[PDB]
Amino acid sequence: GYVLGS
């Protein structure tokens, strides 16, 4: 899985 945040 993956997580991106900004």
From Swiss-Prot:
Superkingdom: Eukaryota
Compartments it resides in: Cell membrane; Golgi apparatus
Post-translational modification: The glycosylation pattern (the amount of mono-, di- and non-glycosylated forms or glycoforms) seems to differ in normal and CJD prion.
Outcome, altering G1V: Protective factor against Kuru; protective factor against prion disease; confers protection against classical Creutzfeldt-Jakob disease (CJD) and Kuru in the heterozygous state but can be infected with variant CJD prions resulting from exposure to bovine spongiform encephalopathy prions; confers complete resistance to all prion strains when homozygous; acts as a 'dominant negative' inhibitor of prion conversion; is not only itself resistant to conformational conversion, but also inhibits conversion of wild-type proteins
Miscellaneous remark of the record: This protein is produced by a bicistronic gene which also produces the alternative prion protein/AltPrP (AC F7VJQ1) from an overlapping reading frame.
Similarity annotation: Belongs to the prion family.
Domain notes: The normal, monomeric form, PRPN(C), has a mainly alpha-helical structure. Misfolding of this form produces a disease-associated, protease-resistant form, PRPN (Sc), accompanied by a large increase of the beta-sheet content and formation of amyloid fibrils. These fibrils consist of a cross-beta spine, formed by a steric zipper of superposed beta-strands. Disease mutations may favor intermolecular contacts via short beta strands, and may thereby trigger oligomerization.
Chain's role: Its primary physiological function is unclear. May play a role in neuronal development and synaptic plasticity. May be required for neuronal myelin sheath maintenance. May promote myelin homeostasis through acting as an agonist for ADGRG6 receptor. May play a role in iron uptake and iron homeostasis. Soluble oligomers are toxic to cultured neuroblastoma cells and induce apoptosis (in vitro). Association with GPC1 (via its heparan sulfate chains) targets PRNP to lipid rafts. Also provides Cu(2+) or Zn(2+) for the ascorbate-mediated GPC1 deaminase degradation of its heparan sulfate side chains.
Subunit annotation: Monomer and homodimer. Has a tendency to aggregate into amyloid fibrils containing a cross-beta spine, formed by a steric zipper of superposed beta-strands. Soluble oligomers may represent an intermediate stage on the path to fibril formation. Copper binding may promote oligomerization. Interacts with GRB2, APP, ERI3/PRNPIP and SYN1. Mislocalized cytosolically exposed PrP interacts with MGRN1; this interaction alters MGRN1 subcellular location and causes lysosomal enlargement. Interacts with KIAA1191. Interacts with ADGRG6.
Disease linkage: PrP is found in high quantity in the brain of humans and animals infected with neurodegenerative diseases known as transmissible spongiform encephalopathies or prion diseases, like: Creutzfeldt-Jakob disease (CJD), fatal familial insomnia (FFI), Gerstmann-Straussler disease (GSD), Huntington disease-like type 1 (HDL1) and kuru in humans; scrapie in sheep and goat; bovine spongiform encephalopathy (BSE) in cattle; transmissible mink encephalopathy (TME); chronic wasting disease (CWD) of mule deer and elk; feline spongiform encephalopathy (FSE) in cats and exotic ungulate encephalopathy (EUE) in nyala and greater kudu.
Name of protein: Major prion protein
